[PDB]
Amino acid sequence: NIPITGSMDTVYSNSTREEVFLTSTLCLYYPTEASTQISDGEWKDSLSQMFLIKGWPTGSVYFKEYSNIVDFSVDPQLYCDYNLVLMKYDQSLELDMSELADLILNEWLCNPMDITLYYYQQSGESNKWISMGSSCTVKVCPLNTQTLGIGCQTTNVDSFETVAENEKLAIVDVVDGINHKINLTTTTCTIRNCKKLGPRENVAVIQVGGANILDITADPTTNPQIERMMRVNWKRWWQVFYTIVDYINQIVQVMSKRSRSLNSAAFYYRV
């Protein structure tokens, strides 16, 4: 990117809220239990009308149901332009909720790994391995410079140190600098070596249940709170949706349009 000079006395431009709502799409991702509690089915159209009151065109708001948190965790495809992810917190799903939130909230440049053949290190702090599928069970075995396992025999998989089992998604970090031999269940899960770029400013995750538990930064030392990790108490999904619709201006202001030149085609939902 070339330099961009600017003056400190340029007059503030007119507001672009009208332009952006006229030329962007809002993109809700809600759990199926939401609709089941709603017990309706004109509600998508009614919410589209209530968004039209706020300013979006009639078709610019797109609702996407998902089964539950882990089932959305496997392969999150965000087919649209400003992504809101409703996320109901329930106990024992803290880590998988955090994994999903991290994966959608950060941009990842990443490429496959042929587990059965090579041994893999990790470049540094911003290099994880992302495993996705029906049932991922990573079983790692660190090696030495002599290529012999430590805490594990290179052949006996039974001695491999499991670090996740039966998770739809797993963002696994291992010691950075050690050649690891991996076993992962090639049929029902695939593992890809991924590196963390800047934030994915296109998404925003709304935790619906209890206290702040999301820790997208895998580092223990830092647990930053991002503007895009919203949290709202709830008892009724209608109340949740009404709050989101009413304060959509604040949400989309907090969120920003994506900025990353992709090399891959996909189905987006644009205007």
Binding site: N1, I4, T10, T221, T222, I226, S256
Partner: protein
Amino acid sequence: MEVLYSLSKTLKDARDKIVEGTLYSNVSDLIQQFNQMIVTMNGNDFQTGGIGNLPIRNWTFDFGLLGTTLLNLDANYVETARTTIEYFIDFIDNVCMDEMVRESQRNGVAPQSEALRKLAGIKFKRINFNNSSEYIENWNLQNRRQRTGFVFHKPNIFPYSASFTLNRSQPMHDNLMGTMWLNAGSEIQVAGFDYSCALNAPANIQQFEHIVQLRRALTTATITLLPDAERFSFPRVINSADGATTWFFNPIILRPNNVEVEFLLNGQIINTYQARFGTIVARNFDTIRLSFQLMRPPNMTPAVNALFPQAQPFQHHATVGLTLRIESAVCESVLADANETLLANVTAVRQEYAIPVGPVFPPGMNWTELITNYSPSREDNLQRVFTVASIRSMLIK
């Protein structure tokens, strides 16, 4: 115009040296000069004004000489001299005022103000008394073409300019890097900021550079160089380059390490100072290169460590800065300062009578637009009117 300065000087001398009880020894040569001036100016009709609201006036001189038989000046001498002197002072004030309101796109240094043009004639060359003040001295040198020098205190060589450049930018403006600067008056305040505090930079050293071009080459300038540019060292909300949105700037002031200032004339290294703050000297220069570095500190107490993470957010934004005052300088061309009142005089005289915007000068004669485009014709007109204003300030304050 030399004759105009001679008129002003001899009136100032007359007002200061023809006083009650002063010996004729103190004032004999001045009386000779005054008598010559009276004889030359008798039987002339000058006309002053006619531009804007400045009123037309007609000046006619018929004044007798001043006595010479008095051993020691008495009262009556002083009253006769003063009734002449107030008239002459009013004439000179009006001549300077009418000269300061006229421009010329071609041949600026030549007089305007038909009164002054008449004074320039060969008849009045016997008034030439003395050319002592700095401005008339440089005027004479220019006509006698050779090096001219005006010594200035806090010269406002820098047009007002506040602005920033971003060498790393995102539409969210969360991980920025670049510089900001205020060039104003004699101040250059420059601040290079990095939001990541040099994580991925080579060896955790981020190089910041700022280039400032002077419109005129200052000479033998004392410059006060300090670190920690203050104006860019507290939280701020800055409009983006195109005005679309506004970004947030939350400084943490690191040391500027291995600073290096180069003073250049015609693009060659005339002076260089590394890590040398305080009073420095620029011998003769036309541009200033300020190059400093934001070096991430390797060792950190936990407070600093918490400030600068390796992660994405970057809540606190590291920065370094320099402040550079030109305390004094010597320029070959006339400038405004914080000491002399010449720009104030000329601008006030223009505004008093509502002179219409002229061909050469900017509207209102604002120094920022006057210095940002300081063409030779503008320099000629500016020197002329500044010399005239300095002449006027001898008598009128």
